[PDB]
Design a binder for this molecule. Sequence first.
Ligand SMILES: Nc1ncnc2c1ncn2[C@@H]1O[C@H](COP(=O)(O)OP(=O)(O)OP(=O)(O)O)[C@@H](O)[C@H]1O
Ligand SMILES: Nc1ncnc2c1ncn2[C@@H]1O[C@H](COP(=O)(O)OP(=O)(O)O)[C@@H](O)[C@H]1O
Ligand code: VO4
Ligand SMILES: [Mg+2]
Ligand SMILES: [Mg+2]
Lengths: 509, 212, 213
Amino acid sequence: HRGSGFTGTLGLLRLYLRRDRVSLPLWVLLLSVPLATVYIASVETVYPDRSARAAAAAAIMASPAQRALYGPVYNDSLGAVGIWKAGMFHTLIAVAVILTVIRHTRADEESGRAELIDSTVVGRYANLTGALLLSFGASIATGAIGALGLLATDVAPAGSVAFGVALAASGMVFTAVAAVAAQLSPSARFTRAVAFAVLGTAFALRAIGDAGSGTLSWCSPLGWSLQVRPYAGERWWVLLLSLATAAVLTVLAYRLRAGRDVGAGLIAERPGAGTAGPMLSEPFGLAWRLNRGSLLLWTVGLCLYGLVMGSVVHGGALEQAFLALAFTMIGMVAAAFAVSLTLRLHQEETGLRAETLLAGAVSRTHWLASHLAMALAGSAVATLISGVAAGLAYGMTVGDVGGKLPTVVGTAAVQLPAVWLLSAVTVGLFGLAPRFTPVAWGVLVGFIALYLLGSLAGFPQMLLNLEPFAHIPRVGGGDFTAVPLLWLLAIDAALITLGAMAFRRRDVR
Amino acid sequence: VPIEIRGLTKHFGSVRALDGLDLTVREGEVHGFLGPNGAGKSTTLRILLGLVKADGGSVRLLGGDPWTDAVDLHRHIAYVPGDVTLWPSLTGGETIDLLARMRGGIDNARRAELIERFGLDPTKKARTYSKGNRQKVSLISALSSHATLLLLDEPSSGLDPLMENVFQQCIGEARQRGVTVLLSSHILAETEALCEKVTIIRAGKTVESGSL
Amino acid sequence: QVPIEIRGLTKHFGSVRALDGLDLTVREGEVHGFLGPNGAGKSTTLRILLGLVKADGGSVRLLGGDPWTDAVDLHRHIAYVPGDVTLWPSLTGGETIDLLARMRGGIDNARRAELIERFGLDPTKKARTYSKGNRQKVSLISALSSHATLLLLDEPSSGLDPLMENVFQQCIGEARQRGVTVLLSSHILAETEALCEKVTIIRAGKTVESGSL
Ligand SMILES: Nc1ncnc2c1ncn2[C@@H]1O[C@H](COP(=O)(O)OP(=O)(O)OP(=O)(O)O)[C@@H](O)[C@H]1O
Ligand SMILES: Nc1ncnc2c1ncn2[C@@H]1O[C@H](COP(=O)(O)OP(=O)(O)O)[C@@H](O)[C@H]1O
Ligand code: VO4
Ligand SMILES: [Mg+2]
Ligand SMILES: [Mg+2]
């Protein structure tokens, strides 16, 4: 008696919510507080005049390269100009909700906790509903806090509410995508890859559309957030387009969960091979075999993104400025790639598969430098390929490809020390405090925040030196000293050698 | 009759997991469940809990289909997995009483006696357990609940010959007071001295089932 | 002529005294049993032997060298079967055998096929579909079919039906014939009598009794 498929949802929600009580408040505050205190606040000092904002609004609609990244500007009002750079939060919130949903649904279910939970009196959809409730609540909280903060400023009141609801809707559209994608494969990494491919496609379509006519910006969940048009005449009804989609997606997710056999996905497995080829006989070969798909996917994605940022660039004092800013994002994404490749060491050790390997003819360095070498090589290859693609596209759309290609390749390659520094940090953490290895992500996020909110908030030029992305030189003409590159490489080497020397004297438990 | 499997079948891919099984457990008796290392035992146990979806046949658990009544019948069933995995951060006592709260019932007088008899140390983070004290957590959390049907998968795995004897004694006491057990053993020293009317499955289909 | 020789081993895990003066000695060609209650120090000793843990005292002479400093030249003659077997979920069952045996002494193609035939494994199936009994045959076949003069088996028959745990006993009896030292840590007091002589019992880190059966 009294049994529904949702029984036990509240308890699962309350033990998911206590699993992450340090991450959720931090990333909910980080995407909501610096809207009325940084972005809107620093428009009365950079553009402190009614006629000064007109020139800035004219210099945005007359340059496709700049409005590919951020979106168009529809008037010279204070709210529209100030919030223009804040149109990047719609992608960060999507990343956050995707990661949270996958982490709570597929990450633990793959580790063997689904059998422990479902054998109890919990319902069938208790786990999915718990995770969706958590993510929807977070995406409401961030939008509500942002709107409440913006309502305390001199901007129009309607636009603040419009932006808050737009942020919440963009957070909700991709939670459903993550829920649908978590029902596909019995591997968490593949589900994350499928979920993030959709977000990458949406961003690429948004950029291509908004750098031109704009009619292609209606075909991507991002874009339905920019056409709400806060502070420029609100299109309220477009919110329905972002609300009628989630309800269609979510009702599909539950359906995929209906008959699915906890532990599986959609396609049954296939037999492999009975013998190991003469390549899988070493830690290097095993490490490469585990990381083929990730490297291929990341390389293809970064190439496709570079092929667009190098084409919208030219429809020399602004071309260099934009090509030095479109590659910092690629540097950050490649740093995330490096960290995700390096954490496979901690994943192996916590899974009791390090002992099986180190109880053989493998030293605690021929094993470390089998994931570390892959992390340092895959990121470099991806960044260089993206740079070549962008340079080729830019040269082709100008007319000559033999002149600009070396400059763009150099601009892409000078990001490498700041990409390897994150692998260095992770390896240094794995060898002193192995349990505290997954905080490397936090460090990365910190750096990103300090890059975005740092200069605008007016921090002194000594707290802004604590990030590596601000020290990278400029390739082209002057402004190239190559001194920060040597310092960054030395720091990477020091961190890596300390992490490696602290692993050789430790207990593998 | 708590169990009435009468022709169950399951195919995962092309792998013939299960090809017609004929289990039948009655009220208040221990019932062995034997077979080789591919027979389809753990799959049958999962199917009875509504966690694998049978692709044919008729399954009947405590009077209702396992798949649709999976939330309602779990108030009378305790499950001990073959591969025991616990939350790393929680403690032994925290795990036991969390699983009790989730199932909505415990017996503290029996729980304390079980902890003192199995020799478990309830205050250690779950990751610091020697896998024999990690099977004891599941044993304590299952034998101390109000369930009236135990689906023990392979309970005495990693237990020294003393805790194994204690486990046999606890199962005897449990069977004395109305609990019904379906036990998969692979150890023919506990099956002989514990249960009767065993059932043997070879490739998915029963080959010999009857009184010991 | 003495593969293992431990004298006065000790190891603290913080406030826990795991080992308090263990004594052990194997004699180059004997199957040595290693019994003890739960929480006695039967793995911790095996993990100290392989160089995965640093001892807090005493002396250890595995095959004639320090287990911690010479932990590479000695592991070309040692086969290890973990207490809880864990495999890679994407590699096939037949690839894990070759991968594991290609870091130790090296696989023996004459015995690999024979062991796959007499254990009845299926070497073309992803390793996340193995039923806890074919997940142990992978480790057993990879360890028995190698060039190793010392086997550190740790509860080797966990999850094996009453016929495969007789095939395993026959395989150990046949492997001991060609001079292969074995250290068998087990809880089933039915295989130790059939295989092992000169057993050693530990209780709380200290050996309590030792000698032949
Ligand atoms: N998730 C799965 N996907 C595909 N095939 C599977 C899956 N789980 C098990 N199998 C296969 O289907 C059959 C079911 O095995 P099952 O788990 O029933 O074995 P078992 O009897 O429990 O083994 P043991 O008795 O040693 O515990 C086996 O052939 C197994 O390899
Ligand atoms: N990482 C660890 N942290 C704390 N205690 C540990 C750790 N590893 C082992 N121990 C302790 O070592 C002792 C023996 O462990 P083990 O050798 O696995 O036991 P057994 O003899 O049952 O095989 C136990 O007291 C156990 O708790
Ligand atoms: O805790 V034990 O390694 O004796 O199963
Ligand atoms: Mg089983
Ligand atoms: Mg052990």
